[PDB]
Subunit: 333 residues, 4 copies
């Protein structure tokens, strides 16, 4: 695997955590703003996902997790990280600032082989495991794993479209709070509503998720769009997709299609449930999106509303590894 | 006014509070489970709406608020409340148990003139101020003010329908917690999801709101339906209405229609805003529903999503008085 | 083990869950208000502690968990439960209503051998693993495991007293929300403050915890007392103990005493930490109380304030099994 | 009054808001990070304290509130603000960065007369209205209004000390979330626990409040100390003071002393209540600290625990004006 992670934020941290669980190998981490001792702390303890079981500790300027030695770098500019030295070939770009092919390339000058941007990109190829991985080729040096919401929407959209054809759809995502929000009314000049006390408000936000689905599933380009609502929950979000289908069908046909997909092609990616589940029943769930059968409702043979859950932090980080596994299987091939 | 209130819950209490503010006159209150001394307490202090300003106190088996003397009864069965004795003619049925014409009538044997059920009813005429009040006539002895959500949806639906015609619509309401939920995972045999910790979950719930709009606005019967999401906020909810219009139009045409309605026919009922508002900016707001101009988005000339806010507690209680005012203006006429 | 559980609430459920984990054997469960199908649901899903891993399912009027067959009864009166039939000898009384030796005895007429009340009792012997288990004898037919808070306080008090002697102490517990609180301002005639919206308030409550420590540790009887503060967190509480010691000492002497106890006599019961921990780092923690070294502060050689955490739900249920294990080791002895 | 405010954060904003209400005059405001149009927004809407009633609007590079014209500056360095130009003589330093006499003086080179630091200071004289104002003199050019917590503790300590003498005391403050906390686990290198998700944790923090009381009330210097607990509530905090008195007394003697003080010397500063109040019943309350009679408990004739509430944002901002009023009465004297 020889994986390298740039940035130790919610994603960076959780990806490393996911890696260890899933067996992937991380050899180096870079972050200029977080001391090595503070790293063992931020990694060991996680309010939402619990304390890391194994042993975490500093070991001669290196981070040691369950025996594994991860060398740590503190470079401010991506093109200074000596990736090659730590032997890191596949870099997970999770800083949120080097999201374009142009600037993401800096990592190459450090000895990096490939770069995976764990966020939407304006020009890098976007992928969603289970939806469009076949379009990947070794020659792609910089790719994007899209956003946590796109990863929830795309799977569901694909099944609906292939079976009944999506004519048009509007999406609303009731999202858990994000790290970019404020505990109390404060300054967010870029997003005014986003600066309002997160623990006391329902905050309307915007989202590119839907528009992005237009990139991973071309046929749907320009047929979907949506917005978000930020609510005071620490983790786990739900997608509310209202769509107009081209073919007439009963809600059962939809449930069937979903269930079938969930145990076949999209198994491990798209989940299916008929239980009376709630937000919390999905913390730590590693699927991209779980179809909530009982939650959705149908108005007419062609106008229906479906509901899909997703652990915005955990499921996404799991797909990041999956993407890298697939990439290496095709590359080292 | 000579108003009487049966039940001292969130609605009962807030209606009395609203009455005093708006000048209406409440002469009697009945509730078998709440001692007279506990009443001054539950009325004076309110976590969401603040401490009552005036003076509240017990005065010889009576409740005294700012000089006003409200006699208190403790009857368990509605047909035992001596309304006539306190001189109460218009009874606000807010217990939640006597919602049908059949059982709501009990109040008449006590000397009551008319009965207003502050909740949906299976057979009593449902009204929404600003939408269908002209359908009211003196001969109606028992009426319903629908639910807090119907009161938010109906106004918006009416404007949309009259201007562009609603072909079909699906509604989702991101609702604040209700008194029927649990602080932590507990027994809710009727609604399994409803018993899950309310402070930590996004709970999918059902709602008759949309179907009810089919009763107050006949033309829309069977063209709308929807569900809810319960989130951990103490008050104020938002309605997310995705609808397919019959006539083509631009989002501005919708904003215009709303703004126009808000300053004319529906003034005081439907509000309009273009500010970057959030959940809290509507606590204490006394309009049935406030159109959030910037929140909505349009996919096509006929497929749009509109967003409307409403203080599910306060706005509804204000409409309860309004309904009674209108009724008496037609009755004592 | 042959354990039986009466009541399927937060404690009843978690105890059964703990049992399975720890290997103890539960053979029967009784609860008149929860259908057998609703039981598999309430047991499988838990907002705070996650989804049960094993397989849970109804199997011919019985509850089956990971192969284990637990027969279910629906008796309303404790003296009708045919414990003997299911072969249940040690009953965990967790209903909260049969807490006195008098009424807890009902279980004996059903064939029960011993009864453990998972809550404070007015007359049944109270125990706290690690503190006074030596007082137990086979002849005791009905015992109490005190409350979740006593189990946190007692261990800490014992260590402090034995080493420096507690002259007097006042305790404050910042407690997570309880199942007896309200989501929004509602009727709590017994505890007026307790009926105020739990998600928006800091609610002062009372507690017998301290006074109870006077029963498990006689020498301290009448030297401790305290109150509580209910805050909007779903689980995990912290005990703030301010005490005046008889012997002079430095805060290190206290840390040492605690650390020593934690790895010796009270190992598994009292935990010790010097990390910058927070409420969540203890969800699922199975110790009765964890001493937070860095949190406490000392004013003088004899006036100090110590802080100890505890997962109010999980730690207590683990001690319930431990108590039964100890009892059987002495009984079947 | 001719007041000037530097910094438009929670304090800065609320002080201006308080000023208008109380009639004081603010002529200028400075803040380099908040655009003039964003100011009208952050001022008009406040999640916790509601929408400002009057009219707020931009008027030729100036902020206009209810007719009042407040000129706005955008200087980054305090010694560049042309205070004199706007005619601002008394500057309220609420940035949180220029808290020492040394750096707070920058304002003088801009034409400022006096400087009030709305936060603790390492070397500027600290005052608490009602406790030590008589210690102020015209020659003091830079003063501090202490912190929101000291203002709650000091009044209570003064009454207890004067009547029964405080031998030693340890204080714990269950504090609402602050603007310096994080919505989700993030980087707080200075305060590791402070970076943990504020909406899901009980976070132990430190506080100088008690030690500060040693400065405003010399006799108590070195006899008090304490810590804090940050809980997920948006506003209003409570102080838990455990103290050992020099004279023996009954809890009634304490209630009496408090009630007496509240209606006499400390009227308007120290409040008194015997109601079953909760966190929310104090939002908007403008007293420095409200003694909760029923919440406290007494162990012995000399060991008692008292509880006092305070709207950490609102009460403090009101005292800031009060301090300035007193200062000018002595200065312009
Ligand atoms: N030039 C840089 N080089 C390296 N690291 C950098 C640089 N600039 C910033 N960083 C690091 O990147 C991290 C930024 O990540 P976060 O802001 O903490 O968030 P992220 O990891 O991107 O996760 C964001 C996601 O998590 C959710 O909480 C949130 O809603 C969002 O969806 C920090 O730890 C920071 O030190
Ligand atoms: N037979 C009866 N006769 C008279 N009063 C009765 C009877 N049965 C119950 N009551 C009283 O009626 C009240 C019921 O009201 P609540 O349950 O407190 O709620 P309600 O007033 O109906 O408001 C419900 C609304 O408030 C929100 O919190 C909630 O989500 C919902 O939208 C109680 O105080 C109760 O004593
Ligand atoms: N007569 C009875 N016989 C048998 N079971 C009964 C009876 N009466 C009630 N029960 C059952 O007992 C259960 C009551 O438990 P809960 O109210 O859910 O609470 P408990 O199990 O006692 O746990 C309480 C603890 O959990 C925290 O949430 C709370 O703060 C407290 O510390 C219910 O499932 C109910 O059906
Ligand atoms: N050099 C400077 N000059 C002028 N203004 C400055 C400077 N540096 C920062 N500021 C401004 O000062 C403000 C800082 O205030 P906040 O951080 O928002 O908080 P404050 O006003 O100090 O109130 C803090 C209090 O409020 C609670 O939320 C919190 O718990 C704390 O007790 C910002 O709006 C910022 O633009």
């Amino acid at each position: 695997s020889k994986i390298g992670i740039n940035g130790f934020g919610r994603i960076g941290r959780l990806v490393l955590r996911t890696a260890l669980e899933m067996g992937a190998q991380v050899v180096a981490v870079n972050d200029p703003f977080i001391a090595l001792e503070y790293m063992v702390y931020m990694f060991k303890y996680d309010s939402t996902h619990g304390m890391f079981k194994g042993e975490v500790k500093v070991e001669d300027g290196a981070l040691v997790v369950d025996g594994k030695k991860i060398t740590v770098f503190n470079e401010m500019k991506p093109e200074n990280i000596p990736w090659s030295k730590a032997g890191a070939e596949y870099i997970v770009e999770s800083t949120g600032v080097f999201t374009t092919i142009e600037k993401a390339s800096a990592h190459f000058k450090g000895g990096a082989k490939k770069v995976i941007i764990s966020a939407p990109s304006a020009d890098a190829p976007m992928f969603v495991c289970g939806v469009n991985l076949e379009k990947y080729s070794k020659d792609m040096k910089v790719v994007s794993n899209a956003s946590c919401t796109t990863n929830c929407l795309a799977p569901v959209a694909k099944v609906l479209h292939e079976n009944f054809e999506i004519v048009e759809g509007l999406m609303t995502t009731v999202h858990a709070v994000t790290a970019t929000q404020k505990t109390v009314d404060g300054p967010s000049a870029k997003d005014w509503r986003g600066g309002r006390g997160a623990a006391q408000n329902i905050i309307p936000s915007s989202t590119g998720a839907a528009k992005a689905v237009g990139k991973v599933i071309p046929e749907l380009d320009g047929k979907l769009t949506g917005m978000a609502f930020r609510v005071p929950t620490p983790n786990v979000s739900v997608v509310d997709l209202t769509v107009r289908l081209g073919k007439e069908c009963s809600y059962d046909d939809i449930k069937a299609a979903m269930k079938t997909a969930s145990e076949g092609p999209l198994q491990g990616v798209l989940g299916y449930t008929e239980d009376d589940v709630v937000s919390c029943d999905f913390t730590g769930d590693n699927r991209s999106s779980i179809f909530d059968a009982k939650a959705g409702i149908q108005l007419s043979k062609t106008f229906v509303k479906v509901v899909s859950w997703y652990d915005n932090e955990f499921g996404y980080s799991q797909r990041v590894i999956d993407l890298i596994k697939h990439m290496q299987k095709v590359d080292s091939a």
